Structure formats: C-alpha cells, structure tokens
Design an enzyme around this catalytic site. Structure first.
Site, PDB file in Angstrom:
ATOM      1  N   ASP A  15      -3.300   8.849  -5.230  1.00 44.99           N
ATOM      2  CA  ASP A  15      -2.901   7.414  -5.162  1.00 44.99           C
ATOM      3  C   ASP A  15      -4.081   6.479  -5.219  1.00 44.99           C
ATOM      4  O   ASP A  15      -3.925   5.262  -4.938  1.00 44.99           O
ATOM      5  CB  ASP A  15      -1.985   7.076  -3.934  1.00 44.99           C
ATOM      6  CG  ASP A  15      -2.634   7.425  -2.605  1.00 44.99           C
ATOM      7  OD1 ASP A  15      -3.894   7.552  -2.602  1.00 44.99           O
ATOM      8  OD2 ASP A  15      -1.880   7.629  -1.625  1.00 44.99           O
ATOM      9  N   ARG A  29      -5.907   1.303  -5.069  1.00 43.20           N
ATOM     10  CA  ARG A  29      -4.923   2.070  -4.290  1.00 43.20           C
ATOM     11  C   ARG A  29      -3.542   1.666  -4.745  1.00 43.20           C
ATOM     12  O   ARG A  29      -3.191   0.470  -4.786  1.00 43.20           O
ATOM     13  CB  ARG A  29      -5.137   1.730  -2.787  1.00 43.20           C
ATOM     14  CG  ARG A  29      -4.089   2.329  -1.832  1.00 43.20           C
ATOM     15  CD  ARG A  29      -4.109   3.891  -1.847  1.00 43.20           C
ATOM     16  NE  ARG A  29      -3.342   4.432  -0.702  1.00 43.20           N
ATOM     17  CZ  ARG A  29      -2.028   4.565  -0.660  1.00 43.20           C
ATOM     18  NH1 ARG A  29      -1.270   4.204  -1.706  1.00 43.20           N
ATOM     19  NH2 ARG A  29      -1.484   5.145   0.409  1.00 43.20           N
ATOM     20  N   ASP A  34       2.639   6.820  -0.949  1.00 47.98           N
ATOM     21  CA  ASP A  34       1.612   7.563  -0.230  1.00 47.98           C
ATOM     22  C   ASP A  34       1.662   8.999  -0.775  1.00 47.98           C
ATOM     23  O   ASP A  34       2.679   9.664  -0.674  1.00 47.98           O
ATOM     24  CB  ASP A  34       1.941   7.558   1.271  1.00 47.98           C
ATOM     25  CG  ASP A  34       0.789   8.165   2.127  1.00 47.98           C
ATOM     26  OD1 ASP A  34      -0.348   8.000   1.743  1.00 47.98           O
ATOM     27  OD2 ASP A  34       1.082   8.758   3.174  1.00 47.98           O
ATOM     28  N   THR A  35       0.578   9.438  -1.376  1.00 41.92           N
ATOM     29  CA  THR A  35       0.460  10.833  -1.752  1.00 41.92           C
ATOM     30  C   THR A  35      -0.169  11.590  -0.613  1.00 41.92           C
ATOM     31  O   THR A  35      -0.927  11.060   0.172  1.00 41.92           O
ATOM     32  CB  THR A  35      -0.386  11.008  -3.055  1.00 41.92           C
ATOM     33  OG1 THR A  35      -1.594  10.262  -2.950  1.00 41.92           O
ATOM     34  CG2 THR A  35       0.372  10.509  -4.351  1.00 41.92           C
ATOM     35  N   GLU A  37      -3.001  13.844   1.163  1.00 41.71           N
ATOM     36  CA  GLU A  37      -4.448  13.996   0.937  1.00 41.71           C
ATOM     37  C   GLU A  37      -4.722  15.328   0.247  1.00 41.71           C
ATOM     38  O   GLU A  37      -3.888  16.243   0.274  1.00 41.71           O
ATOM     39  CB  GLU A  37      -5.236  13.896   2.250  1.00 41.71           C
ATOM     40  CG  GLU A  37      -4.958  12.607   3.045  1.00 41.71           C
ATOM     41  CD  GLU A  37      -5.427  11.298   2.366  1.00 41.71           C
ATOM     42  OE1 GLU A  37      -6.544  11.300   1.795  1.00 41.71           O
ATOM     43  OE2 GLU A  37      -4.709  10.238   2.439  1.00 41.71           O
ATOM     44  N   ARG A  75     -10.278  -2.082  -1.510  1.00 46.43           N
ATOM     45  CA  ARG A  75      -9.558  -1.471  -2.619  1.00 46.43           C
ATOM     46  C   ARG A  75      -8.586  -2.472  -3.218  1.00 46.43           C
ATOM     47  O   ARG A  75      -7.908  -3.182  -2.502  1.00 46.43           O
ATOM     48  CB  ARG A  75      -8.791  -0.225  -2.128  1.00 46.43           C
ATOM     49  CG  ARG A  75      -9.726   0.821  -1.570  1.00 46.43           C
ATOM     50  CD  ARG A  75      -8.942   2.120  -1.204  1.00 46.43           C
ATOM     51  NE  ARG A  75      -7.956   1.817  -0.152  1.00 46.43           N
ATOM     52  CZ  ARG A  75      -7.160   2.707   0.419  1.00 46.43           C
ATOM     53  NH1 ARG A  75      -7.273   4.015   0.119  1.00 46.43           N
ATOM     54  NH2 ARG A  75      -6.196   2.289   1.237  1.00 46.43           N
TER      55      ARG A  75
HETATM   56  C1  THP Z   1      -1.022   1.028   0.166  1.00 50.11           C
HETATM   57  C2  THP Z   1      -1.661   0.124   1.187  1.00 50.11           C
HETATM   58  C3  THP Z   1      -2.519   0.637   2.102  1.00 50.11           C
HETATM   59  N1  THP Z   1      -3.125  -0.170   3.032  1.00 50.11           N
HETATM   60  C4  THP Z   1      -3.982   0.305   4.149  1.00 50.11           C
HETATM   61  C5  THP Z   1      -3.055   0.724   5.348  1.00 50.11           C
HETATM   62  C6  THP Z   1      -3.737   2.017   5.898  1.00 50.11           C
HETATM   63  O1  THP Z   1      -4.699   1.573   6.866  1.00 50.11           O
HETATM   64  P1  THP Z   1      -5.354   2.742   7.768  1.00 50.11           P
HETATM   65  O2  THP Z   1      -6.622   3.303   6.969  1.00 50.11           O
HETATM   66  O3  THP Z   1      -5.877   2.019   8.943  1.00 50.11           O
HETATM   67  O4  THP Z   1      -4.414   3.952   8.064  1.00 50.11           O
HETATM   68  C7  THP Z   1      -4.465   2.606   4.637  1.00 50.11           C
HETATM   69  C8  THP Z   1      -3.726   3.821   4.055  1.00 50.11           C
HETATM   70  O5  THP Z   1      -4.405   4.120   2.808  1.00 50.11           O
HETATM   71  P2  THP Z   1      -4.525   5.687   2.452  1.00 50.11           P
HETATM   72  O6  THP Z   1      -3.159   6.307   2.394  1.00 50.11           O
HETATM   73  O7  THP Z   1      -5.278   5.668   1.089  1.00 50.11           O
HETATM   74  O8  THP Z   1      -5.301   6.434   3.612  1.00 50.11           O
HETATM   75  O9  THP Z   1      -4.533   1.535   3.655  1.00 50.11           O
HETATM   76  C9  THP Z   1      -2.904  -1.505   2.996  1.00 50.11           C
HETATM   77  O10 THP Z   1      -3.427  -2.243   3.866  1.00 50.11           O
HETATM   78  N2  THP Z   1      -2.059  -2.053   2.082  1.00 50.11           N
HETATM   79  C10 THP Z   1      -1.428  -1.294   1.153  1.00 50.11           C
HETATM   80  O11 THP Z   1      -0.616  -1.820   0.401  1.00 50.11           O
HETATM   81 CA    CA Z   2      -2.726   8.905   0.762  1.00 46.57          CA
END
Ligand code: THP
Ligand code: CA
Length: 129
Positions: A15, A29, A34-35, A37, A75
């Site tokens: 993702d 991103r 959510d994929t 890890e 991102r």
């Molecule tokens: C997809 C997405 C993720 N995020 C943030 C929330 C999560 O914060 P936390 O890192 O604090 O868990 C993180 C999850 O991304 P990943 O799934 O790439 O880890 O990215 C956003 O803020 N907005 C979005 O639209």
């Molecule tokens: Ca992920």
C-alpha cells in the site's frame, strides 16, 4: 476528483509506492486500504500485486481526495491508477487489502471499495480464506 501525472520510482509494499509527482519524489500511501506488512500473512503477496500493477503500466496517475493530501509522516494520500485501473480497488477486490482508515472528507471511493471487499469475502479470497 481529478487524475494527475506521476512517474513510478519504486514499489515499496502492498500500500505504499514511491513516485515522482510534480517533479519531486513522494512516498504515496494508498487511501482507504490496509495491506498486511511484508512480514505478515499475505504481506509478500500484497507487495507483489502492487509492484506488478505499477511496474507493468504504461502510465500511473495519482488522484487526491477532497481532504488532506499528506499524512503525519509526509506521505502523499491518494488513489493510484495503473493504465486507468485503480490499485486501491484492485487490492481490495483480490482480498489482499482490507478497507481501512476511512476518514470523513477523504472517502470519495469508500463505497466502491466496500463493494469490492464484499465480493472478495464472498469468494473467500486470500485474507478472507
Ligand atoms: C491511510 C492513512 C493512514 N494514515 C496514518 C494512520 C496510521 O497512523 P499510525 O502510524 O500512528 O498507526 C498510519 C497507518 O499507515 P500504515 O498502515 O502504512 O502503517 O498512517 C493517515 O493518517 N491517513 C490515511 O489516510
Ligand atoms: Ca499497511
């Protein structure tokens, strides 16, 4: 929403994709998914799926939603299209991502992706197997 040009730099995982956007390198991103890890079940499979899709395309495009365009990590948050096919939807439809992180104001394609997820779940694909 509108599709804008980007050029692939590197597929990172299921993702996240690095692409050049307005001439600067950005890590994107994927919105609304959510994929797993890479070290989790179906993680390698999600990564391969996204990599094939973006690497094989003649063009990729990014589509921002109405809300925030970057997250707290810097991102880009977008829907990514590979030769006009949405990666975010394709992942969900194959059971390689769950619909997730659905924030109000950046959820234009939520229903589309929920319908894909229902279909993947009916077919018991991958994460749903
Ligand atoms: C997809 C997405 C993720 N995020 C943030 C929330 C999560 O914060 P936390 O890192 O604090 O868990 C993180 C999850 O991304 P990943 O799934 O790439 O880890 O990215 C956003 O803020 N907005 C979005 O639209
Ligand atoms: Ca992920």
């Amino acid at each position: 929403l509108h599709k804008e040009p980007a050029t692939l730099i590197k597929a990172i995982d299921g993702d996240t994709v690095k692409a050049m956007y307005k001439g600067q390198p950005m890590t994107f991103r994927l919105l609304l998914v959510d994929t797993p890890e890479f070290n989790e079940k179906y993680g390698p499979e999600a990564s391969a799926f996204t990599k094939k899709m973006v690497e094989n395309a003649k063009k990729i495009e990014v589509e921002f939603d109405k809300g925030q365009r970057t997250d707290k990590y810097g991102r880009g948050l977008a829907y990514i299209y590979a030769d006009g096919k949405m990666v975010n939807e394709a992942l969900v439809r194959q059971g390689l991502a769950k619909v997730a992180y659905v924030y109000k104001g950046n959820n234009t394609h939520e229903q589309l992706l929920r319908k894909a997820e229902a279909q993947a779940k009916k077919e018991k694909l991958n994460i749903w197997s």
